[PDB]
């Protein structure tokens, strides 16, 4: 028979075994993450080993089928996902070596600890130095936590990361890729459609084209934050200089959310919080998810399954089991979707029960697609669908309707700029960090950054792109980027940049379909069924169709566009351009805190 | 003495595989169609050619019952005119089928921790199965133009595959015991007549 019939039969054979081998591994990771024990970790590794071995050996068989001999669009995308494997193209010695390096890095990061003035403490990252970084405002103590963590983890990871780069550049080149920074950009590659073709070198073009418009908005926010930090830290920051890294409200500076108390626009007016209000109405740990479901039902999305409630750990169990309480959504397979979050009922646990319940709605939508095509269209669509639910659930209009706010609640311009500035420290304050970090790793893999200039080009870019200056001079011995969780465990970081761009392309499109009359930050897609019949036209597609086509179905354009993001923060930008009239805008790379 | 052995077929301890669907020809039956209709425990109860009303006036020559455990989402595939892996390769109903189809969820009965892989279904077949046909052959399916020689190789896969029935799956991926009742009409003494 033809290759199409010989591969369609093969994919049917793969699906039956894969749909029940990955599920058994998914029912072992879940059990370990819901009950940590010595036997569970053994079962988790044993189950995943069978699936890992099965997936690679099936990929080798799939490569025997010529891809060009398949004339079915829905069949090629499954072969592409199946054939395009990784780490199986290296020698058995090097493949063993790569996992040895990739496991030491994930061990040094977790085991990192630093010395405290109370010497016998050995503070771990979490809980620990995170509390120091996210809550303290002491210049001396934050500098010790910043430099200390990079002294321990950074120095140790540097010899391993230098061998991580070369080994990952041998797997990529053997797999017909330029560099390991080209393997990561292959998630955004479409090479089968006409008029929907996206190359691996066009992502760099769009990432650097959408960042040339964020910069005018980021400069105003950076100037305003810098002005407020001078009040908090007198004689510590130059008025026209860059921001020291340890003063960004985080260990690395990814999110500026912890700079809100210092940078409240209207300090007298409190923020809109319903933490106390929910407790007054006897809101249980399950009432949040029941109310969160009512939001997705209002827009027309399907209800959560009956098995979801029974099998999900919505509340912290009383039994002393070591539950990993990282809030995550589980796509186990076989029609089983679960959310792992120990509810500690609080406003932030009401705005993160719409993001995890927005990952399931995305997972439930493409459950009818073939097993290989069960995932986001790209790596930036699965984390962006959940976030647009947080935008709708954070608006005062949504909270007021549910009854968590008084019926006579008055929305003044004071609170409008307090909410927008709290979203800017998270949405538009992470893009320069996310863009610079991925741009650094891309050039390191490419070769534009020699072995002797890793920490010279890391801070030259950060002082130029991010506007963050070194608290202390770091030589080649340190490895500052490796201290981040994603860098040290071989995880891509351009997922969090495209996600933010897709957040508001989806949000603006849904609000336009929702007949929203006014600003884009007050939009609440709740009770609108025309914003759930257009969002679901991209959710159902999954990975079957190119992300460019999926993007056009909901938004209307085939290209990454940052124009909706600026419209969301446009009311804030006008206020930011009137509060920075008496303060300089921009940063000078020359100034350094350690110069004096 | 004349009680219909519905309990033997509708409440057996263990059902048969989809491809090896059991057929039982039952005679001398005073059938209480009401208890089947009023069971209030059947997930899917679709009857083709017979109204949900009693309709006990008509008599039939004989009644056939077929037993198997298909997945939950595969119940839709069993109907006149439907197509699918179960319909085309395992159990096909003719377009002129006259009978009643009874299905109910079988979780906690055919499911266990680890997976109840005993049940098997036919995934690959050379041609579409005829209506009311049964196949038990274990010959290796040949997808390519190379001799399989009775061993699982490239383009040579075993036609039978094992259902994975976990107790935590969704309603689609959970075992569903289905019993199909057929109505035989021809010139005969018609031992089984409705009251
Ligand atoms: Zn997420």
Numbering used by the authors:
A (entry chain A): 19 to 614
B (entry chain B): 333 to 527
Could you pull the original sentences from the published paper?
SARS-CoV-2 uses the receptor-binding domain (RBD) in the S protein to interact with angiotensin-converting enzyme 2 (ACE2), which is also the receptor of SARS-CoV. We found that ACE2s from sperm whales, minke whales, dolphins, sea lions, fur seals and hippopotami could efficiently bind to the RBD of both SARS-CoV and SARS-CoV-2 and facilitate the transduction of SARS-CoV and SARS-CoV-2 pseudoviruses into ACE2-expressing cells.
We prepared complexes of MW-ACE2/SARS-CoV-2 RBD, MW-ACE2/SARS-CoV RBD, SL-ACE2/SARS-CoV-2 RBD and SL-ACE2/SARS-CoV RBD, and solved their structures at resolutions of 2.87, 2.93, 3.03 and 2.89 Å, respectively. MW-ACE2/SARS-CoV-2 RBD and SL-ACE2/SARS-CoV-2 RBD display similar architectures to hACE2 in complex with SARS-CoV-2 RBD, with root mean squared deviations (RMSDs) of 0.995 Å and 0.594 Å, respectively. In patch 1, Q24 and Y83 on MW-ACE2 form an H-bond network with N487 and Y489 on the SARS-CoV-2 RBD in the MW-ACE2/SARS-CoV-2 RBD complex, whereas in the other three complexes, only Y83 forms an H-bond with N473 or N487. In patch 2, H34, D38, Y41 and K352 (corresponding to K353 in hACE2) on MW-ACE2 form an H-bond network with S494, Y449, T500, G496 and G502 on the SARS-CoV-2 RBD, respectively. Structural analysis indicated that D30Q loses the salt bridge between K417 and D30, which may lead to decreased binding affinity. The side chain of R42 on MW-ACE2, though much longer than Q42 on hACE2, is bent away from its interacting residues on the SARS-CoV-2 RBD and fails to form any polar interactions, while Q42 on hACE2 forms three H-bonds with the RBD. Substitution of G326 on hACE2 with its MW-ACE2 counterpart E325 brings with it a longer side chain, which forms additional interactions with the RBD and expands the binding interface. On the SARS-CoV-2 RBD, E484 and F490 exclusively interact with hACE2, while S477, S494, Y495, V503 and Q506 only interact with MW-ACE2 but not hACE2.
